[PDB]
């Protein structure tokens, strides 16, 4: 979901 997408994008 978006939360996971935020996780990966900020890495």
């Amino acid at each position, epitope marked *: *979901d*978006f*939360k996971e*997408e*935020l*996780d990966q*994008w*900020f890495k």
Partner: antibody
Amino acid sequence: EVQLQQSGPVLVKPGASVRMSCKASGYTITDYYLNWVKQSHGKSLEWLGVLNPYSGGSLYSQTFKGKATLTVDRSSSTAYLELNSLTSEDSAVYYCARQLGRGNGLDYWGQGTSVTVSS
Amino acid sequence: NIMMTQSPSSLAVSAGEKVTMSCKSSQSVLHSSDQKNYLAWYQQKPGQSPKLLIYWASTRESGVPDRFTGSGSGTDFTLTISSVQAEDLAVYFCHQYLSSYTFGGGTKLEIKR
């Protein structure tokens, strides 16, 4: 000190595009992420997306995909928000706001750019 | 999306009074990798840009007076101002950034004199 200087207010015709700027000073623009947040009235805030000033990449809210485009000019320490296909409902103050990392709040906000969409 | 609801819409107190205001999320804002509630509070004074007060639900931003305190877990969050000052009048917004960022509708704090 830290400052986010945003460009002046604009009047735009419905259907057109607008690009506004957010100039970082007092810190290295590439050390923080930069969000864009819309305020339609005093009691409303809505997130558009976030820019990675170092890489130039961006992550958009699904609401603003295909509507907003985030860019950056690292040499001039300036980030940009472009909005297309403007409607009268796109009228709002648009803030840029920096964010250190994933878990941080929006620790500093520009003064906002007032966009009025009207004939 | 995660919806944020704030209550009350507005309140008014005399200087020196204590104030609490509520912020509820439609689901948990707890980030698993660091076990922090991705919950922030902002103060927006009239004609000014928002100012960060609290992050991680309870961590006070540098330069924020100690009278501002955030608390809560799960889906029920609270901003407390222990002794309201005349300059504290603003709209206070809460903010979840676990998922696609959403903000509460704000609580407008007014001063009685």
